[PDB]
Amino acid sequence: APDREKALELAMAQIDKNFGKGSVMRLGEEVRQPISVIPTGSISLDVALGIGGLPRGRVIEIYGPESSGKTTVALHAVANAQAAGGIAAFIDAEHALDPEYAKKLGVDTDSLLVSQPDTGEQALEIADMLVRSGALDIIVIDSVAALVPRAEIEGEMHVGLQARLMSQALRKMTGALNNSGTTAIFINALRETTTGGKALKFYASVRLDVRRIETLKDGTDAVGNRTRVKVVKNKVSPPFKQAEFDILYGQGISREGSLIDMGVEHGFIRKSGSWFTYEGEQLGQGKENARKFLLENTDVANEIEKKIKEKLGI
């Protein structure tokens, strides 16, 4: 009577039904759940996510050391939800946002709702209220850590409160997020759990481990920094995939850079040691020269984007 593959699928099906699609998956499964997404700003990360971007109506955690590139991704996500006509909100407990930098990443600052709460409770309630209006495509909360409880803020001499705070708010908010379809990005700067990163680990549909890995030099001097993101949790597509990309000083994710990495790995652009070539024409010697080439030769790149796009999904 026993036929494993048969029994297994019956079990997996039963599992998803009882707990939700994505409760169990084969790591190599080719996901076919289009959903609705907010492109990450990084083509590769969109691919790593398996669905083309951050899922809508879900809790997203983006953690890692400072200057890891978390905020950049958050800002790009906002920029993209806006181009699609979405409205964005920013719950700020850090007072670090640099609107001029955000504009550069394409964010329409003037339309950005910003709120600087007095307490963690207040910050999450304001977020809950904004979300339940169903009017937002995305909402980013700067600093899970910054969400300190009112009592602490007022000198209360008694603990476990800030994590409990993140739990209860997350319990209430997820419902509205799904109904509204608003993607909520919690930025968690570390020094995976910043007091309340505890409940966030379970409530999230996606958790991004962001980390700096290399300083982009090309020549002796610095041009920017390369970031590596690992999708440690993904309840909508097989997890653990990884992605890398360049964020040049004063710029967001380098599109050209992403086109040069995927293009090389997917054979569209050949790379003999030190020289990048594309179907019968030189791009230059050195990751950076190629970037320069693609920045200028806008016609190229678009086709390379085209090809890389078609090859996976546009």
Ligand X SMILES: Nc1ncnc2c1ncn2[C@@H]1O[C@H](COP(=O)(O)OP(=O)(O)OP(O)(O)=S)[C@@H](O)[C@H]1O
Could you say whether residue 86 binds ligand X (CB under 6 A)?
Answer: no
Angstrom CA distances, 87 to 77, 90, 168, stand at 12, 11, 26
Options 15-23, 124-132, 146-154, 245-253: segment touching ligand X (CB under 6 A): 245-253
Stretch 137-176: interaction string toward Cl ion, x if CB under 5 A: ----------------------------------------
From the CB of 77, what's the least distance to ligand X, in Å? Answer: 11
From the CB of 192, what's the least distance to ligand X, in Å? Answer: 14
Residues of this chain, 18-57, that bind Cl ion according to CB under 5 A: 39
Could you say whether residue 69 binds ligand X (CB under 6 A)?
Answer: yes
Could you say whether residue 215 binds ligand X (CB under 6 A)?
Answer: no
Name which of 105 and 236 has its Cβ closer to ligand X: 105
User: How many residues sit in the footprint of Cl ion (CB under 5 A)?
Assistant: 1
Q: Give the separation between CA 17 and CA 77, rounded to whole angstroms.
A: 30
CA atoms within 13 A on the CB side of 34: 2
Could you say whether residue 249 binds ligand X (CB under 6 A)?
Answer: yes
CA atoms within 13 A on the CB side of 276: 25
From the CB of 57, what's the least distance to ligand X, in Å? Answer: 24
Q: Give the separation between CA 155 and CA 311, rounded to whole angstroms.
A: 58
The binder of 162, among ligand X, Cl ion, none, by C-beta within 5 to 8 A per type, is: none
Name which of 200 and 269 has its Cβ closer to ligand X: 200
Options 37-45, 128-136, 175-183, 242-250: segment touching ligand X (CB under 6 A): 242-250
User: Interface residues with Cl ion (CB under 5 A)?
Assistant: 39
User: Interface residues with ligand X (CB under 6 A)?
Assistant: 64, 66-72, 96, 98, 101, 189, 210, 224-225, 247, 249-250
